[PDB]
mmCIF file of N, CA and C and ligand atoms in Angstrom:
data_model
loop_
_atom_site.group_PDB
_atom_site.id
_atom_site.type_symbol
_atom_site.label_atom_id
_atom_site.label_comp_id
_atom_site.label_asym_id
_atom_site.label_seq_id
_atom_site.Cartn_x
_atom_site.Cartn_y
_atom_site.Cartn_z
ATOM 1 N N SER A 1 -74.677 -45.203 74.446
ATOM 2 C CA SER A 1 -73.658 -45.319 75.483
ATOM 3 C C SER A 1 -72.732 -44.109 75.430
ATOM 4 N N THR A 2 -71.779 -44.049 76.361
ATOM 5 C CA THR A 2 -70.878 -42.908 76.452
ATOM 6 C C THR A 2 -70.015 -42.790 75.198
ATOM 7 N N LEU A 3 -69.393 -41.620 75.051
ATOM 8 C CA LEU A 3 -68.477 -41.403 73.937
ATOM 9 C C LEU A 3 -67.288 -42.356 74.008
ATOM 10 N N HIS A 4 -66.691 -42.512 75.195
ATOM 11 C CA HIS A 4 -65.501 -43.356 75.270
ATOM 12 C C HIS A 4 -65.841 -44.820 75.017
ATOM 13 N N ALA A 5 -67.040 -45.260 75.408
ATOM 14 C CA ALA A 5 -67.461 -46.621 75.089
ATOM 15 C C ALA A 5 -67.590 -46.821 73.583
ATOM 16 N N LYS A 6 -68.163 -45.836 72.881
ATOM 17 C CA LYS A 6 -68.314 -45.940 71.433
ATOM 18 C C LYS A 6 -66.968 -46.096 70.735
ATOM 19 N N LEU A 7 -65.944 -45.392 71.214
ATOM 20 C CA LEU A 7 -64.686 -45.252 70.490
ATOM 21 C C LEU A 7 -63.583 -46.163 71.013
ATOM 22 N N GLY A 8 -63.925 -47.180 71.795
ATOM 23 C CA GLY A 8 -62.960 -48.165 72.243
ATOM 24 C C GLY A 8 -62.387 -47.968 73.633
ATOM 25 N N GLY A 9 -62.906 -47.031 74.413
ATOM 26 C CA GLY A 9 -62.405 -46.786 75.752
ATOM 27 C C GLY A 9 -61.741 -45.424 75.874
ATOM 28 N N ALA A 10 -61.468 -45.059 77.130
ATOM 29 C CA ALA A 10 -60.895 -43.744 77.404
ATOM 30 C C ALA A 10 -59.521 -43.593 76.765
ATOM 31 N N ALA A 11 -58.669 -44.618 76.884
ATOM 32 C CA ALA A 11 -57.358 -44.565 76.245
ATOM 33 C C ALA A 11 -57.492 -44.303 74.751
ATOM 34 N N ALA A 12 -58.468 -44.948 74.108
ATOM 35 C CA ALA A 12 -58.653 -44.780 72.670
ATOM 36 C C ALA A 12 -59.083 -43.356 72.326
ATOM 37 N N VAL A 13 -59.900 -42.736 73.179
ATOM 38 C CA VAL A 13 -60.337 -41.365 72.917
ATOM 39 C C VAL A 13 -59.135 -40.433 72.843
ATOM 40 N N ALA A 14 -58.270 -40.477 73.859
ATOM 41 C CA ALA A 14 -57.092 -39.615 73.849
ATOM 42 C C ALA A 14 -56.184 -39.946 72.673
ATOM 43 N N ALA A 15 -56.060 -41.235 72.340
ATOM 44 C CA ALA A 15 -55.237 -41.619 71.201
ATOM 45 C C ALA A 15 -55.807 -41.058 69.911
ATOM 46 N N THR A 16 -57.133 -41.109 69.756
ATOM 47 C CA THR A 16 -57.767 -40.559 68.556
ATOM 48 C C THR A 16 -57.524 -39.060 68.445
ATOM 49 N N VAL A 17 -57.658 -38.339 69.563
ATOM 50 C CA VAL A 17 -57.400 -36.900 69.568
ATOM 51 C C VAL A 17 -55.967 -36.607 69.127
ATOM 52 N N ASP A 18 -54.997 -37.378 69.634
ATOM 53 C CA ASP A 18 -53.600 -37.147 69.268
ATOM 54 C C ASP A 18 -53.368 -37.389 67.780
ATOM 55 N N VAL A 19 -53.909 -38.489 67.249
ATOM 56 C CA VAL A 19 -53.804 -38.755 65.812
ATOM 57 C C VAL A 19 -54.350 -37.572 65.019
ATOM 58 N N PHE A 20 -55.546 -37.113 65.395
ATOM 59 C CA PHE A 20 -56.242 -36.057 64.672
ATOM 60 C C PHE A 20 -55.487 -34.744 64.786
ATOM 61 N N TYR A 21 -55.036 -34.415 65.997
ATOM 62 C CA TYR A 21 -54.251 -33.207 66.223
ATOM 63 C C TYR A 21 -52.990 -33.192 65.366
ATOM 64 N N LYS A 22 -52.251 -34.304 65.358
ATOM 65 C CA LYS A 22 -50.986 -34.338 64.631
ATOM 66 C C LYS A 22 -51.209 -34.213 63.131
ATOM 67 N N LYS A 23 -52.288 -34.811 62.613
ATOM 68 C CA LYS A 23 -52.632 -34.624 61.201
ATOM 69 C C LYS A 23 -52.807 -33.146 60.864
ATOM 70 N N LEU A 24 -53.525 -32.397 61.709
ATOM 71 C CA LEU A 24 -53.739 -30.981 61.421
ATOM 72 C C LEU A 24 -52.431 -30.202 61.488
ATOM 73 N N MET A 25 -51.625 -30.441 62.528
ATOM 74 C CA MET A 25 -50.389 -29.678 62.661
ATOM 75 C C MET A 25 -49.378 -30.042 61.580
ATOM 76 N N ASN A 26 -49.469 -31.237 61.007
ATOM 77 C CA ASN A 26 -48.518 -31.645 59.987
ATOM 78 C C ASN A 26 -49.009 -31.355 58.578
ATOM 79 N N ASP A 27 -50.178 -30.731 58.436
ATOM 80 C CA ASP A 27 -50.708 -30.371 57.132
ATOM 81 C C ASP A 27 -50.336 -28.922 56.854
ATOM 82 N N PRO A 28 -49.446 -28.649 55.896
ATOM 83 C CA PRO A 28 -49.034 -27.256 55.644
ATOM 84 C C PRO A 28 -50.177 -26.341 55.252
ATOM 85 N N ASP A 29 -51.285 -26.883 54.752
ATOM 86 C CA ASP A 29 -52.424 -26.051 54.392
ATOM 87 C C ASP A 29 -53.274 -25.651 55.591
ATOM 88 N N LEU A 30 -53.119 -26.322 56.724
ATOM 89 C CA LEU A 30 -53.940 -26.064 57.905
ATOM 90 C C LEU A 30 -53.160 -25.523 59.092
ATOM 91 N N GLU A 31 -51.924 -25.972 59.283
ATOM 92 C CA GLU A 31 -51.129 -25.537 60.430
ATOM 93 C C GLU A 31 -51.123 -24.025 60.638
ATOM 94 N N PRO A 32 -51.017 -23.176 59.607
ATOM 95 C CA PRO A 32 -50.949 -21.734 59.884
ATOM 96 C C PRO A 32 -52.142 -21.196 60.654
ATOM 97 N N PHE A 33 -53.330 -21.804 60.540
ATOM 98 C CA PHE A 33 -54.470 -21.347 61.340
ATOM 99 C C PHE A 33 -54.280 -21.612 62.826
ATOM 100 N N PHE A 34 -53.361 -22.496 63.198
ATOM 101 C CA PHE A 34 -53.142 -22.808 64.605
ATOM 102 C C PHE A 34 -51.955 -22.062 65.215
ATOM 103 N N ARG A 35 -51.237 -21.270 64.422
ATOM 104 C CA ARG A 35 -50.131 -20.473 64.942
ATOM 105 C C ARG A 35 -50.609 -19.517 66.028
ATOM 106 N N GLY A 36 -49.932 -19.541 67.170
ATOM 107 C CA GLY A 36 -50.309 -18.684 68.270
ATOM 108 C C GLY A 36 -51.423 -19.210 69.152
ATOM 109 N N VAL A 37 -52.042 -20.337 68.807
ATOM 110 C CA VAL A 37 -53.071 -20.935 69.654
ATOM 111 C C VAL A 37 -52.407 -21.857 70.669
ATOM 112 N N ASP A 38 -52.626 -21.577 71.951
ATOM 113 C CA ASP A 38 -52.004 -22.363 73.006
ATOM 114 C C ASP A 38 -52.496 -23.808 72.953
ATOM 115 N N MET A 39 -51.669 -24.714 73.467
ATOM 116 C CA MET A 39 -51.916 -26.145 73.295
ATOM 117 C C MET A 39 -53.108 -26.630 74.112
ATOM 118 N N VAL A 40 -53.394 -25.984 75.240
ATOM 119 C CA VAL A 40 -54.546 -26.392 76.038
ATOM 120 C C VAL A 40 -55.827 -26.119 75.263
ATOM 121 N N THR A 41 -55.935 -24.918 74.697
ATOM 122 C CA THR A 41 -57.072 -24.588 73.847
ATOM 123 C C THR A 41 -57.202 -25.567 72.684
ATOM 124 N N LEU A 42 -56.079 -25.939 72.061
ATOM 125 C CA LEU A 42 -56.136 -26.808 70.888
ATOM 126 C C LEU A 42 -56.587 -28.212 71.266
ATOM 127 N N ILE A 43 -56.001 -28.772 72.323
ATOM 128 C CA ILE A 43 -56.410 -30.099 72.771
ATOM 129 C C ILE A 43 -57.882 -30.088 73.159
ATOM 130 N N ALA A 44 -58.328 -29.026 73.839
ATOM 131 C CA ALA A 44 -59.739 -28.937 74.205
ATOM 132 C C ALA A 44 -60.615 -28.849 72.965
ATOM 133 N N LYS A 45 -60.171 -28.088 71.959
ATOM 134 C CA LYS A 45 -60.899 -28.013 70.699
ATOM 135 C C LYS A 45 -61.083 -29.392 70.080
ATOM 136 N N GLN A 46 -59.998 -30.165 69.993
ATOM 137 C CA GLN A 46 -60.077 -31.461 69.331
ATOM 138 C C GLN A 46 -61.007 -32.398 70.082
ATOM 139 N N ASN A 47 -60.958 -32.360 71.415
ATOM 140 C CA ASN A 47 -61.860 -33.186 72.212
ATOM 141 C C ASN A 47 -63.316 -32.806 71.993
ATOM 142 N N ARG A 48 -63.613 -31.506 71.920
ATOM 143 C CA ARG A 48 -64.996 -31.087 71.722
ATOM 144 C C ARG A 48 -65.460 -31.376 70.292
ATOM 145 N N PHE A 49 -64.550 -31.241 69.320
ATOM 146 C CA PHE A 49 -64.843 -31.603 67.929
ATOM 147 C C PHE A 49 -65.252 -33.065 67.842
ATOM 148 N N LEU A 50 -64.457 -33.940 68.461
ATOM 149 C CA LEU A 50 -64.762 -35.365 68.467
ATOM 150 C C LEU A 50 -66.086 -35.641 69.172
ATOM 151 N N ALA A 51 -66.300 -35.016 70.334
ATOM 152 C CA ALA A 51 -67.562 -35.199 71.043
ATOM 153 C C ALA A 51 -68.746 -34.733 70.191
ATOM 154 N N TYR A 52 -68.599 -33.585 69.519
ATOM 155 C CA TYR A 52 -69.668 -33.053 68.675
ATOM 156 C C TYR A 52 -69.996 -33.994 67.521
ATOM 157 N N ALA A 53 -68.971 -34.531 66.861
ATOM 158 C CA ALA A 53 -69.213 -35.451 65.753
ATOM 159 C C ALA A 53 -70.080 -36.637 66.177
ATOM 160 N N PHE A 54 -70.035 -37.019 67.452
ATOM 161 C CA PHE A 54 -70.799 -38.163 67.931
ATOM 162 C C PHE A 54 -71.928 -37.767 68.871
ATOM 163 N N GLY A 55 -72.399 -36.525 68.779
ATOM 164 C CA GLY A 55 -73.548 -36.085 69.555
ATOM 165 C C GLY A 55 -73.370 -36.156 71.055
ATOM 166 N N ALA A 56 -72.138 -36.019 71.547
ATOM 167 C CA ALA A 56 -71.864 -36.076 72.975
ATOM 168 C C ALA A 56 -71.733 -34.699 73.618
ATOM 169 N N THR A 57 -71.887 -33.620 72.861
ATOM 170 C CA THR A 57 -71.914 -32.291 73.451
ATOM 171 C C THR A 57 -73.350 -31.917 73.816
ATOM 172 N N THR A 58 -73.488 -30.973 74.744
ATOM 173 C CA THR A 58 -74.811 -30.514 75.151
ATOM 174 C C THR A 58 -75.054 -29.026 74.926
ATOM 175 N N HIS A 59 -74.017 -28.188 74.948
ATOM 176 C CA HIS A 59 -74.195 -26.746 74.813
ATOM 177 C C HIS A 59 -73.440 -26.186 73.614
ATOM 178 N N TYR A 60 -73.348 -26.962 72.540
ATOM 179 C CA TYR A 60 -72.554 -26.577 71.385
ATOM 180 C C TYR A 60 -73.390 -26.776 70.131
ATOM 181 N N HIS A 61 -73.698 -25.682 69.439
ATOM 182 C CA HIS A 61 -74.586 -25.726 68.288
ATOM 183 C C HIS A 61 -73.978 -24.918 67.149
ATOM 184 N N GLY A 62 -74.659 -24.928 65.999
ATOM 185 C CA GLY A 62 -74.120 -24.265 64.819
ATOM 186 C C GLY A 62 -73.747 -22.817 65.071
ATOM 187 N N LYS A 63 -74.573 -22.099 65.831
ATOM 188 C CA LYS A 63 -74.252 -20.702 66.103
ATOM 189 C C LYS A 63 -72.952 -20.570 66.894
ATOM 190 N N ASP A 64 -72.669 -21.516 67.794
ATOM 191 C CA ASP A 64 -71.401 -21.488 68.517
ATOM 192 C C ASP A 64 -70.231 -21.783 67.585
ATOM 193 N N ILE A 65 -70.423 -22.691 66.625
ATOM 194 C CA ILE A 65 -69.370 -22.949 65.646
ATOM 195 C C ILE A 65 -69.066 -21.684 64.853
ATOM 196 N N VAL A 66 -70.107 -20.950 64.444
ATOM 197 C CA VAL A 66 -69.871 -19.722 63.684
ATOM 198 C C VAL A 66 -69.145 -18.694 64.543
ATOM 199 N N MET A 67 -69.628 -18.470 65.769
ATOM 200 C CA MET A 67 -69.005 -17.454 66.615
ATOM 201 C C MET A 67 -67.557 -17.806 66.935
ATOM 202 N N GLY A 68 -67.235 -19.097 67.019
ATOM 203 C CA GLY A 68 -65.860 -19.497 67.296
ATOM 204 C C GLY A 68 -64.909 -19.393 66.114
ATOM 205 N N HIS A 69 -65.433 -19.396 64.883
ATOM 206 C CA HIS A 69 -64.594 -19.434 63.686
ATOM 207 C C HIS A 69 -64.758 -18.237 62.766
ATOM 208 N N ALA A 70 -65.702 -17.334 63.050
ATOM 209 C CA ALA A 70 -66.007 -16.247 62.118
ATOM 210 C C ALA A 70 -64.782 -15.387 61.846
ATOM 211 N N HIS A 71 -63.961 -15.141 62.869
ATOM 212 C CA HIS A 71 -62.774 -14.316 62.662
ATOM 213 C C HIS A 71 -61.788 -14.959 61.688
ATOM 214 N N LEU A 72 -61.720 -16.297 61.644
ATOM 215 C CA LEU A 72 -60.822 -16.961 60.699
ATOM 216 C C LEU A 72 -61.324 -16.823 59.269
ATOM 217 N N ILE A 73 -62.641 -16.911 59.083
ATOM 218 C CA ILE A 73 -63.241 -16.773 57.760
ATOM 219 C C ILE A 73 -63.139 -15.333 57.276
ATOM 220 N N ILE A 74 -63.312 -14.375 58.180
ATOM 221 C CA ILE A 74 -63.364 -12.967 57.791
ATOM 222 C C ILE A 74 -61.974 -12.354 57.675
ATOM 223 N N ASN A 75 -61.060 -12.715 58.565
ATOM 224 C CA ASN A 75 -59.767 -12.059 58.644
ATOM 225 C C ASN A 75 -58.616 -12.940 58.176
ATOM 226 N N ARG A 76 -58.832 -14.250 57.997
ATOM 227 C CA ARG A 76 -57.730 -15.151 57.677
ATOM 228 C C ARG A 76 -58.004 -16.077 56.490
ATOM 229 N N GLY A 77 -59.083 -15.864 55.738
ATOM 230 C CA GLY A 77 -59.312 -16.633 54.530
ATOM 231 C C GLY A 77 -59.678 -18.086 54.737
ATOM 232 N N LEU A 78 -60.227 -18.440 55.898
ATOM 233 C CA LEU A 78 -60.661 -19.815 56.141
ATOM 234 C C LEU A 78 -61.806 -20.163 55.197
ATOM 235 N N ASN A 79 -61.723 -21.324 54.547
ATOM 236 C CA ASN A 79 -62.677 -21.614 53.479
ATOM 237 C C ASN A 79 -63.090 -23.086 53.484
ATOM 238 N N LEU A 80 -63.932 -23.440 52.505
ATOM 239 C CA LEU A 80 -64.487 -24.785 52.441
ATOM 240 C C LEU A 80 -63.414 -25.831 52.161
ATOM 241 N N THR A 81 -62.363 -25.469 51.420
ATOM 242 C CA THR A 81 -61.282 -26.423 51.202
ATOM 243 C C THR A 81 -60.615 -26.760 52.530
ATOM 244 N N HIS A 82 -60.421 -25.758 53.381
ATOM 245 C CA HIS A 82 -59.861 -26.036 54.695
ATOM 246 C C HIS A 82 -60.789 -26.937 55.502
ATOM 247 N N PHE A 83 -62.100 -26.639 55.495
ATOM 248 C CA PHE A 83 -63.065 -27.471 56.220
ATOM 249 C C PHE A 83 -63.017 -28.914 55.739
ATOM 250 N N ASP A 84 -63.015 -29.110 54.415
ATOM 251 C CA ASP A 84 -63.020 -30.465 53.876
ATOM 252 C C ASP A 84 -61.738 -31.212 54.218
ATOM 253 N N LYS A 85 -60.619 -30.494 54.373
ATOM 254 C CA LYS A 85 -59.373 -31.163 54.738
ATOM 255 C C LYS A 85 -59.391 -31.574 56.208
ATOM 256 N N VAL A 86 -59.867 -30.682 57.089
ATOM 257 C CA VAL A 86 -60.013 -31.017 58.504
ATOM 258 C C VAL A 86 -60.963 -32.196 58.666
ATOM 259 N N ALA A 87 -62.088 -32.166 57.946
ATOM 260 C CA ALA A 87 -63.065 -33.250 58.043
ATOM 261 C C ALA A 87 -62.488 -34.564 57.533
ATOM 262 N N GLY A 88 -61.724 -34.511 56.439
ATOM 263 C CA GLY A 88 -61.070 -35.721 55.948
ATOM 264 C C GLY A 88 -60.053 -36.277 56.933
ATOM 265 N N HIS A 89 -59.230 -35.404 57.523
ATOM 266 C CA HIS A 89 -58.299 -35.885 58.538
ATOM 267 C C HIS A 89 -59.037 -36.508 59.709
ATOM 268 N N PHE A 90 -60.208 -35.974 60.056
ATOM 269 C CA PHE A 90 -60.951 -36.532 61.178
ATOM 270 C C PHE A 90 -61.399 -37.962 60.887
ATOM 271 N N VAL A 91 -62.022 -38.191 59.728
ATOM 272 C CA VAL A 91 -62.496 -39.544 59.451
ATOM 273 C C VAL A 91 -61.314 -40.481 59.230
ATOM 274 N N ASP A 92 -60.221 -39.988 58.640
ATOM 275 C CA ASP A 92 -59.018 -40.806 58.542
ATOM 276 C C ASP A 92 -58.525 -41.211 59.925
ATOM 277 N N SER A 93 -58.575 -40.288 60.895
ATOM 278 C CA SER A 93 -58.176 -40.637 62.256
ATOM 279 C C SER A 93 -59.041 -41.757 62.801
ATOM 280 N N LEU A 94 -60.355 -41.672 62.590
ATOM 281 C CA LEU A 94 -61.247 -42.713 63.086
ATOM 282 C C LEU A 94 -60.927 -44.065 62.454
ATOM 283 N N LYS A 95 -60.673 -44.086 61.140
ATOM 284 C CA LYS A 95 -60.341 -45.338 60.466
ATOM 285 C C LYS A 95 -59.032 -45.914 60.986
ATOM 286 N N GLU A 96 -58.020 -45.065 61.165
ATOM 287 C CA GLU A 96 -56.732 -45.536 61.666
ATOM 288 C C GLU A 96 -56.839 -46.131 63.063
ATOM 289 N N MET A 97 -57.797 -45.668 63.854
ATOM 290 C CA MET A 97 -58.032 -46.200 65.188
ATOM 291 C C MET A 97 -58.949 -47.421 65.177
ATOM 292 N N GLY A 98 -59.300 -47.930 63.998
ATOM 293 C CA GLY A 98 -60.172 -49.083 63.919
ATOM 294 C C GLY A 98 -61.625 -48.813 64.231
ATOM 295 N N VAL A 99 -62.093 -47.583 64.061
ATOM 296 C CA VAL A 99 -63.507 -47.277 64.260
ATOM 297 C C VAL A 99 -64.303 -47.793 63.068
ATOM 298 N N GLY A 100 -65.471 -48.374 63.338
ATOM 299 C CA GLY A 100 -66.232 -49.033 62.300
ATOM 300 C C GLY A 100 -67.050 -48.087 61.443
ATOM 301 N N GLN A 101 -67.627 -48.664 60.386
ATOM 302 C CA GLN A 101 -68.250 -47.877 59.327
ATOM 303 C C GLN A 101 -69.520 -47.178 59.791
ATOM 304 N N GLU A 102 -70.296 -47.809 60.673
ATOM 305 C CA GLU A 102 -71.519 -47.172 61.143
ATOM 306 C C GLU A 102 -71.202 -45.882 61.891
ATOM 307 N N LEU A 103 -70.157 -45.902 62.728
ATOM 308 C CA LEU A 103 -69.741 -44.690 63.431
ATOM 309 C C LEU A 103 -69.131 -43.665 62.478
ATOM 310 N N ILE A 104 -68.358 -44.116 61.479
ATOM 311 C CA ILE A 104 -67.844 -43.191 60.468
ATOM 312 C C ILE A 104 -68.988 -42.431 59.811
ATOM 313 N N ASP A 105 -70.001 -43.165 59.345
ATOM 314 C CA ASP A 105 -71.116 -42.545 58.639
ATOM 315 C C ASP A 105 -71.816 -41.526 59.521
ATOM 316 N N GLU A 106 -72.013 -41.864 60.797
ATOM 317 C CA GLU A 106 -72.667 -40.943 61.715
ATOM 318 C C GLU A 106 -71.865 -39.652 61.846
ATOM 319 N N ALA A 107 -70.552 -39.778 62.048
ATOM 320 C CA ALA A 107 -69.696 -38.600 62.147
ATOM 321 C C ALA A 107 -69.733 -37.786 60.860
ATOM 322 N N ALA A 108 -69.671 -38.464 59.711
ATOM 323 C CA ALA A 108 -69.715 -37.777 58.429
ATOM 324 C C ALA A 108 -71.004 -36.984 58.270
ATOM 325 N N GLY A 109 -72.143 -37.581 58.633
ATOM 326 C CA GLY A 109 -73.402 -36.860 58.543
ATOM 327 C C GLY A 109 -73.395 -35.576 59.352
ATOM 328 N N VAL A 110 -72.826 -35.625 60.558
ATOM 329 C CA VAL A 110 -72.738 -34.421 61.381
ATOM 330 C C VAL A 110 -71.886 -33.370 60.685
ATOM 331 N N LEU A 111 -70.693 -33.770 60.232
ATOM 332 C CA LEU A 111 -69.765 -32.824 59.611
ATOM 333 C C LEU A 111 -70.360 -32.204 58.355
ATOM 334 N N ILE A 112 -70.963 -33.034 57.500
ATOM 335 C CA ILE A 112 -71.642 -32.516 56.316
ATOM 336 C C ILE A 112 -72.702 -31.500 56.722
ATOM 337 N N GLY A 113 -73.390 -31.757 57.837
ATOM 338 C CA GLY A 113 -74.430 -30.849 58.295
ATOM 339 C C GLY A 113 -73.937 -29.454 58.635
ATOM 340 N N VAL A 114 -72.690 -29.327 59.104
ATOM 341 C CA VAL A 114 -72.171 -28.017 59.490
ATOM 342 C C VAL A 114 -71.242 -27.410 58.444
ATOM 343 N N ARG A 115 -70.918 -28.143 57.382
ATOM 344 C CA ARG A 115 -70.101 -27.588 56.306
ATOM 345 C C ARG A 115 -70.598 -26.239 55.787
ATOM 346 N N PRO A 116 -71.900 -26.015 55.551
ATOM 347 C CA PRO A 116 -72.333 -24.705 55.029
ATOM 348 C C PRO A 116 -71.950 -23.514 55.897
ATOM 349 N N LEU A 117 -71.654 -23.707 57.186
ATOM 350 C CA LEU A 117 -71.234 -22.587 58.021
ATOM 351 C C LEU A 117 -69.806 -22.145 57.740
ATOM 352 N N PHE A 118 -69.071 -22.889 56.923
ATOM 353 C CA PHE A 118 -67.716 -22.527 56.545
ATOM 354 C C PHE A 118 -67.644 -22.025 55.114
ATOM 355 N N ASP A 119 -68.789 -21.699 54.522
ATOM 356 C CA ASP A 119 -68.838 -21.094 53.200
ATOM 357 C C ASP A 119 -68.565 -19.595 53.321
ATOM 358 N N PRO A 120 -67.434 -19.112 52.806
ATOM 359 C CA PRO A 120 -67.107 -17.684 52.960
ATOM 360 C C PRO A 120 -68.122 -16.758 52.316
ATOM 361 N N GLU A 121 -68.883 -17.225 51.326
ATOM 362 C CA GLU A 121 -69.876 -16.354 50.701
ATOM 363 C C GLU A 121 -70.955 -15.909 51.680
ATOM 364 N N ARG A 122 -71.115 -16.615 52.798
ATOM 365 C CA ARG A 122 -72.083 -16.252 53.825
ATOM 366 C C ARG A 122 -71.612 -15.120 54.741
ATOM 367 N N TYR A 123 -70.376 -14.645 54.601
ATOM 368 C CA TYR A 123 -69.796 -13.660 55.507
ATOM 369 C C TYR A 123 -69.462 -12.387 54.742
ATOM 370 N N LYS A 124 -69.438 -11.252 55.450
ATOM 371 C CA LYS A 124 -69.063 -9.969 54.860
ATOM 372 C C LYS A 124 -67.706 -9.509 55.391
ATOM 373 N N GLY A 125 -67.143 -8.490 54.739
ATOM 374 C CA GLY A 125 -65.934 -7.856 55.244
ATOM 375 C C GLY A 125 -64.692 -8.724 55.233
ATOM 376 N N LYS A 126 -64.625 -9.706 54.333
ATOM 377 C CA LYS A 126 -63.497 -10.623 54.298
ATOM 378 C C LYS A 126 -62.262 -9.954 53.699
ATOM 379 N N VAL A 127 -61.104 -10.564 53.937
ATOM 380 C CA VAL A 127 -59.867 -10.106 53.296
ATOM 381 C C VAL A 127 -59.987 -10.120 51.765
HETATM 382 C C1 LIG B 201 -66.999 -29.243 62.094
HETATM 383 C C2 LIG B 201 -66.204 -28.174 62.097
HETATM 384 C C3 LIG B 201 -65.470 -27.645 63.353
HETATM 385 C C4 LIG B 201 -65.756 -27.822 64.652
HETATM 386 C C5 LIG B 201 -66.966 -28.585 65.241
HETATM 387 C C6 LIG B 201 -64.739 -27.129 65.418
HETATM 388 C C7 LIG B 201 -64.651 -27.045 66.794
HETATM 389 C C8 LIG B 201 -63.965 -26.069 67.482
HETATM 390 C C9 LIG B 201 -64.038 -25.798 68.900
HETATM 391 C C10 LIG B 201 -64.935 -26.610 69.856
HETATM 392 C C11 LIG B 201 -63.233 -24.757 69.189
HETATM 393 C C12 LIG B 201 -63.019 -24.123 70.600
HETATM 394 C C13 LIG B 201 -61.560 -24.205 71.051
HETATM 395 C C14 LIG B 201 -61.371 -23.795 72.499
HETATM 396 O O1 LIG B 201 -61.670 -22.612 72.857
HETATM 397 O O2 LIG B 201 -60.893 -24.663 73.288
HETATM 398 C C15 LIG B 201 -62.617 -24.339 67.937
HETATM 399 C C16 LIG B 201 -61.706 -23.328 67.725
HETATM 400 C C17 LIG B 201 -60.850 -23.270 66.640
HETATM 401 N N1 LIG B 201 -60.988 -23.954 65.444
HETATM 402 FE FE1 LIG B 201 -62.401 -25.256 64.991
HETATM 403 N N2 LIG B 201 -63.839 -26.552 64.536
HETATM 404 C C18 LIG B 201 -64.257 -26.870 63.262
HETATM 405 C C19 LIG B 201 -63.651 -26.491 62.089
HETATM 406 C C20 LIG B 201 -62.429 -25.876 62.028
HETATM 407 C C21 LIG B 201 -61.623 -25.729 60.852
HETATM 408 C C22 LIG B 201 -62.008 -26.266 59.457
HETATM 409 C C23 LIG B 201 -60.502 -25.093 61.185
HETATM 410 C C24 LIG B 201 -59.364 -24.758 60.202
HETATM 411 C C25 LIG B 201 -58.088 -24.798 60.598
HETATM 412 C C26 LIG B 201 -60.575 -24.789 62.605
HETATM 413 C C27 LIG B 201 -59.661 -24.099 63.370
HETATM 414 C C28 LIG B 201 -59.909 -23.613 64.642
HETATM 415 C C29 LIG B 201 -59.092 -22.667 65.375
HETATM 416 C C30 LIG B 201 -57.790 -22.043 64.845
HETATM 417 C C31 LIG B 201 -59.653 -22.467 66.567
HETATM 418 C C32 LIG B 201 -59.143 -21.566 67.729
HETATM 419 C C33 LIG B 201 -59.493 -20.108 67.464
HETATM 420 C C34 LIG B 201 -58.917 -19.294 68.600
HETATM 421 O O3 LIG B 201 -58.979 -19.758 69.766
HETATM 422 O O4 LIG B 201 -58.415 -18.178 68.336
HETATM 423 N N3 LIG B 201 -61.765 -25.283 63.073
HETATM 424 N N4 LIG B 201 -63.076 -25.168 66.939
#
C-alpha cells in the first residue's frame, strides 16, 4: 500500500517528518551539517529519506545518496558516527509515532544497507 497508509495516514507522515527533523536540529553533533541549508530543501530531504526507508522512492539509489553527500564526507568530516546518529533518530521517530516493529525492521534493513556509503575510508581528498 501507499507510504501514508503504512505510517498511519497523511497527517502522520508530516508529523513523523517534523519529529525526525527536530531531533536532527536539536542534536549538537548533527545540527552543524544543516547550517546554511534552506528549510524547503531540508523538509524535502526528510520526506525523501522517509520514503526511501520504506521503498516508496523510484529514482533514488545508492549512487544518488553518494552524489548528494560526498561533499560533506570530503570537505566537512561527515562520518559513520553521524550516520548512525541520524539513523537512530529516524527509528526513534518511528517508535514515538507508534509505528510497529515489522515496519521498524524494514526501515532498519534499508538504512543498514546504505551505511557503507558513509564510510570515509571510501573517499579521497578529505579534510
Ligand atoms: C540513509 C542515509 C541518508 C539518506 C537516504 C539521505 C537523504 C538525503 C536526501 C534525499 C537529500 C536531498 C535534499 C534535497 O535536495 O532536498 C539529502 C541531502 C542532505 N543530507 Fe542526507 N541523507 C542521509 C544521510 C545523511 C546524514 C547522515 C547526514 C548528516 C547530517 C545528512 C545530511 C544531509 C545534508 C546536510 C543534506 C543537504 C546538502 C546540501 O543541500 O547542501 N544526510 N539527504
